[model samples]
Target: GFLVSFMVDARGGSMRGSRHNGLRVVIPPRTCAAPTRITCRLVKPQKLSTPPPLAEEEGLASRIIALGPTGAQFLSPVIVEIPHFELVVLRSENGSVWKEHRSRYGESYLDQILNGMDEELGSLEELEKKRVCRIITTDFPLYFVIMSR
Candidate 1:
């Protein structure tokens, strides 16, 4: 597992995993009022205390990632870009169940972003052979796992 951290202020900043590969985070201006320490890391699925559950049609497609301060809120949504292969769906744990995060248009977030839809909540795109998951939200302490059918 690998990890990186950045001290981001109200003006915002960006950081990427040095050894974890394709993990990147971009904090936009006005996202935070005070300086915050943000961290992103590759985590082994088995190491999770309550690992995400898989559906009958889904299988793990990328390394599980843990993005913290666990439940921090931001004034503006932050952007995250993760590297992956194949068609994948992004899942995050909410409460005790793993839920698929979709876009406002009722399609896979990735598909919506790929189709050029402007989803204000969440979207995904493929860049340089890697599936890029982009989401806008105030919730933090996100645990992300990519799944494929």
Candidate 2:
């Protein structure tokens, strides 16, 4: 007696023969629908976003970069670099267990030291200019390398 009641159409399943464009097929919605309400989440952190300052002397660091307010900029970086040196602790070169302390660090420190030495001696290319620096380091077996700009 209601929608359950049905009657056969005058024709069969064959009805529409033309093609339709821009048609969308949405499932029939349930009796009710509403706008959505949701929340977002994030993960916890374990490390710092940046490293601490090197605390290198301004004079020394400036030379590394080679640009400053003063036309004649700072010319020094602390040369703690132990130059490549092979030492036989027992004073025996042949049989003594020789420990080689070498400078594996990059050339920036050397560059600064040479710059400072040059400024002291008054030329960037004076090969004989003596270099001066403050070396800060912990207890370690190391040697020194003479640096010039």
Candidate 3:
């Protein structure tokens, strides 16, 4: 029941062709248990090339496009509970680190993070099935992402 958060260069993403477009869906760093061996490479930026410089802000404010570009260089994937959303990841730098890209253009961005938590927890369930560990979903969602051992 651990989340392995790592950063990787988009150019060298695990996917060879037809790279991911728009906002990254899986958050790259999530490591959840499965029915078989799982490998979530937790690599440091040392081996990675220096990231590109962020966009120039000279015309950022008054640009005709109005596309507010942003960047986070050393984002460490964050974990949070629904109760402390304001005090934790969401409020941290105005949730800028929450995504590896600018705000979602269409559809709901908030739902993506929430839904990912559920999906990762489900993946861990497979480990429980293999380890003979008991899982109980409680009335609250917090318990939805935990394992006994």
Candidate 4:
């Protein structure tokens, strides 16, 4: 009953209810049944059962460093400059113009990076007393922000 109600809600109907003490209850629509109330418990959705395989296809794969041993590297605050373009134009030689627009432009995710760096930094146990690293990425239109724990 709750599953049907959820499907109806997904297909453009509304399910009205309230949540308290980890329990949820809602009213049912008339598509599958008459007007009535239904109950459902909430649970986290499961992800894919398996990860994708990385096999040899072209060039050789290389490992600069290994996981589970590397410690995480935190960084220092580095300033950067980027151009502020107020105008952008899109035109074609076929006599069609998509008009022009103005002004620009903008901005994580540390846990994912920190998790990967466990190979280099050993883990949070070792990362606590280590010095902050100074890193600058090699790319266009860049900025930096550092977090401290």
Which candidate should be chosen as best, given TM-score against the real structure? 1
Give TM-scores for every candidate, taking all chains together and pairing residue i with residue i.
Answer: 0.72, 0.17, 0.19, 0.15
lDDT of 3 at 6: 30
TM-score ranking, high to low:
1, 3, 2, 4
For all candidates in order, the CA lDDT equals 0.63, 0.19, 0.21, 0.20
Give, for candidate 2, the lowest lDDT window spanning 10 residues: 83-92
Q: How many backbone clashes does candidate 1 have?
A: 1
Task: Return whichever of 1 and 3 wins on TM-score.
Answer: 1
Once fitted onto the true fold, the runs of candidate 4 whose alpha carbons sit more than 4 angstroms away are 1-119, 133-141, 147-149
- What is the overall TM-score of model 1 with all chains considered together? 0.72
TM-score of structure candidate 3: 0.19
lDDT string for model 1 (87-116, tens) is: 454656443557765534333333322233
lDDT of 2 by residue, 1-149 (tens): 01111111212111111122111111111101222111111111112122112234311111111110112111122222111101211111222122322334433344433432322212223311322222221112212112221
Which candidate number has the best lDDT? 1
Query: What tens digits encode model 3's per-residue C-alpha lDDT throughout 46-80?
Result: 33233212335311111010001112221323222
Clashing pairs in 4: 69-119, 70-118, 70-119, 70-120, 70-121, 70-122, 71-120, 71-121, 71-122
